[PDB]
Amino acid sequence: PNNRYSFIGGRTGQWQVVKIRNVLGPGLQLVEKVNILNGADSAWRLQGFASNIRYAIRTELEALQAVQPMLNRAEAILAVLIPIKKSAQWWEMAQDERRDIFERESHHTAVGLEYLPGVAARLLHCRDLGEEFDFLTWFEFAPEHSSAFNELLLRMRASKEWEYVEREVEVWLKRL
Amino acid sequence: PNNRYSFIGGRTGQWQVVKIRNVLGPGLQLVEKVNILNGADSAWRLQGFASNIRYAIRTELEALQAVQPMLNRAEAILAVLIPIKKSAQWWEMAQDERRDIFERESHHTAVGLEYLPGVAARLLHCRDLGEEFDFLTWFEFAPEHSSAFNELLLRMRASKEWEYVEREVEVWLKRL
């Protein structure tokens, strides 16, 4: 299967843009909709690929898989696309050094796990494609989990891991 | 810098093909030369990108960086391009499972270090590009190290890590 995904902010698409929050660094132009395409009057295009696990260990994968919801739940009419760029200092670090910041210090997985099965979370990579961002992260959930997701954001943005994030944008969406 | 690299088997290039050893699975067609281009009458093209560290820890990087030779040494008139693909079962494993096979069991980095500084080794990734191979590995050295390189290839093709390799080709080259 084609692991590449494109996100085109413009006048067409499956998702209506509710709000774009330019958290850190240059933002993305406000647009009417986002069109998601599998494969590679529009304002911007983002792309990334699905890839293998980079940090999670087996016990962590087992916990996530036990409560990970699927995409495209009927109830999951809200979504958020959050492109993220990390710093050169982050990328120069070795594998043991990044894993320790990611979990042992920041507890990325343990914290995110608390918000499943409510939130469906998916990760795409794009630093290797030469894109402006390093990751395209995608979340979808029913309105009942909006407050919980907003809470999770504040939590991760306070984390040690986020000291290495240098560009970030929120594209809040509603399923059409 | 652009991190994409292309290897075109045909009748032009910086490198003459000495031989091709179809080690495992379908091979590559014999050609006169290989052309290497930086960016995205020819028989085949391979491509991959340089990426961040996936397994090596800080102390291993420091030991590697202490002896790793540069590319394009005057005496490094031989080169070997070895595309590699690993199994689906490999990519399904978690990060800890793969690290433990990579170093704890196979000692890929420790064995590799023994063959530096003679052998310059570079790694490119292409599974994420949808390529038929997962990695393009590049090696260049002087003739005095040809025998030691063949020794290295045998020590690695015998390790537990290589039990997950399901396709492999050796393209031996000579600088023009």
Ligand code: HEM
């Ligand atoms: C909601 C529940 C969440 C869960 C269960 C979760 C889980 C995970 C896991 C297990 C990984 C590691 C993947 C791997 O090993 O390759 C990861 C990576 C990542 N997550 Fe989350 N996450 C959640 C929320 C979030 C949020 C809200 C954000 C952004 C605001 C985010 C941003 C990222 C990024 C950027 C990465 C890549 C880290 C890197 O490779 O440097 N995640 N996530």
Ligand code: HEM
């Ligand atoms: C000659 C000395 C060598 C040294 C010092 C060395 C070192 C390394 C290191 C440290 C890594 C881990 C990179 C990371 O953490 O992302 C790596 C990856 C790799 N090397 Fe070697 N290597 C050598 C020879 C070879 C040879 C001869 C081959 C093939 C015959 C090879 C094939 C690979 C492959 C396929 C990977 C990717 C592994 C994966 O990501 O699953 N290497 N090498």
Ligand SMILES: O=N[O-]
């Ligand atoms: O966990 N980032 O979808």
Ligand SMILES: O=N[O-]
């Ligand atoms: O370690 N790849 O030459």
